[PDB]
């Protein structure tokens, strides 16, 4: 195999023929240099946005891959100049990833139980790395999970303090923002490739009347998303 070792180990993790397995993903995976500025930005995003009620583990980046799914860029194109783009987290159980890369992130079917989906059937993201890492569900026996960074064209946000359970946005809105009591420090956000990186440390958002501790970002068209990076994570408890 001509693949770089990190890519081969990631292939092993997601699938359990290494190059055939890699081709099965229909995804161009490349490794990010440990000494680059891209990597430093991603690691600072991980460092500063670890919530304080998620102190059961202590994160630690292992590998950082830049991923490009086939068609995802030409499918995301129409929503690109859409203002308010943000680079956000998405966690999921490891076995799901072999699919997430081949099919992309998807929405629950049109007739599933909308209960459990606090803000209706959509694609969810968080600006606190730990809020998403919780969904990797990585225990002490298997303390390695995968988490995605995605450019999300949030557009005009419908800001909500409580649950809705509906997937229909008031015309003029492109995404939902569940307002958390704690938000990344906006005085520290940067703009990487024109995408807003909210890597600021956790501060108080100023909203008292709200159900969520940390912000949630939901979209409802799967083409509002563009997966940029993929992270191997060591969970230390």
**Interacting residues with ligand YNQ (CB under 6 A):** 89-92, 96, 100, 105-106, 116-117, 124-126, 131-132, 135, 216
Q: Is 172 left (phi over 0), alpha (psi -120 to 50) or beta?
A: left
Q: Closest separation between CB of residue 19 and ligand YNQ, Å?
A: 25
The smaller minimum CB distance to ligand YNQ, of residues 5 and 162, is found at 162
Q: Closest separation between CB of residue 209 and ligand YNQ, Å?
A: 20
Catalytic-role residue among 37, 70, 111, 216: 216
Do the Cβ atoms of 160 and 80 come closer than 8 Å?
no
Q: What's the DSSP call for residue 58?
A: B
Q: Name the phi and psi angles at 218, rounded to 5.
A: -115, 135
40 has catalytic annotation: no
Q: Report the alpha-carbon distance of residue 183 to residue 206 in Å, rounded.
A: 9
> Which residue has the closest beta carbon to ligand YNQ?
92
CA-based end-to-end distance of the chain: 35
| 5-15 vs 94-103: helix crossing angle, rounded to 10 | 110
Spell out the residues 6+ positions from residue 189 whose beta carbon is closer than 8 angstroms to its own.
Answer: 196, 197, 198, 199, 200
The smaller minimum CB distance to ligand YNQ, of residues 1 and 54, is found at 54
Grouping H, G, I as helix, E, B as strand and the rest as coil, residue 77 is helix
**SS3 per residue for 161-224:** CCCCCCCCCCCCCCEEEECEEEEECHHHCEEECCEEECCCCEEECCCCCCCEEECEEEECCHHH
Q: Report the alpha-carbon distance of residue 88 to residue 129 in Å, rounded.
A: 8
To the question of whether residue 137 is assigned a binding role by annotation, the answer is: no
To the question of whether residue 130 is assigned a binding role by annotation, the answer is: no
To the question of whether residue 172 is assigned a binding role by annotation, the answer is: no
To the question of whether residue 106 is assigned a binding role by annotation, the answer is: yes
What residues form the annotated binding site for NAD(+)?
A: 90-92, 99, 106, 132
Catalytic (active-site) positions? 216
């Amino acid at each position: 195999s001509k693949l770089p070792k990190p890519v081969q180990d990631l292939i092993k993790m997601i699938f359990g023929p290494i190059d055939v397995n890699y081709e099965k993903l229909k995804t161009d995976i490349k490794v990010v240099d440990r000494d680059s500025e891209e990597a430093e930005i991603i690691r600072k995003y991980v460092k500063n946005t670890h919530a304080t009620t998620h102190n059961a583990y202590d994160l630690e980046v292992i590998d950082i891959f830049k991923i490009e799914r086939e068609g995802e860029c030409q499918r995301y194109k129409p929503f690109k100049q859409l203002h308010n783009r943000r680079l956000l987290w998405h966690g999921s159980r490891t076995t799901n990833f072999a699919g997430i890369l081949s099919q992309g992130l998807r929405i629950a079917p049109p007739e599933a139980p909308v209960t459990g989906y606090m803000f209706g059937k959509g694609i969810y993201f968080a600006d606190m790395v730990s809020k998403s890492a919780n969904y990797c569900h990585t225990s002490q026996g298997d303390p390695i999970g995968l988490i995605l960074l995605g450019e999300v064209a949030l557009g005009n946000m419908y800001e909500l303090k409580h649950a809705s359970h509906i997937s229909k946005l008031p015309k003029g809105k492109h995404s939902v923002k569940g307002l958390g009591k704690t938000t990344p420090d906006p005085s520290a956000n940067i703009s990487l490739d024109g995408v807003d990186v909210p890597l600021g440390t956790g501060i108080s958002s100023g909203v008292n009347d709200t159900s969520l501790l940390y912000n949630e970002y939901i979209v409802y068209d799967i083409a509002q998303v563009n997966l940029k990076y993929l992270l191997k994570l060591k969970f230390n408890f």
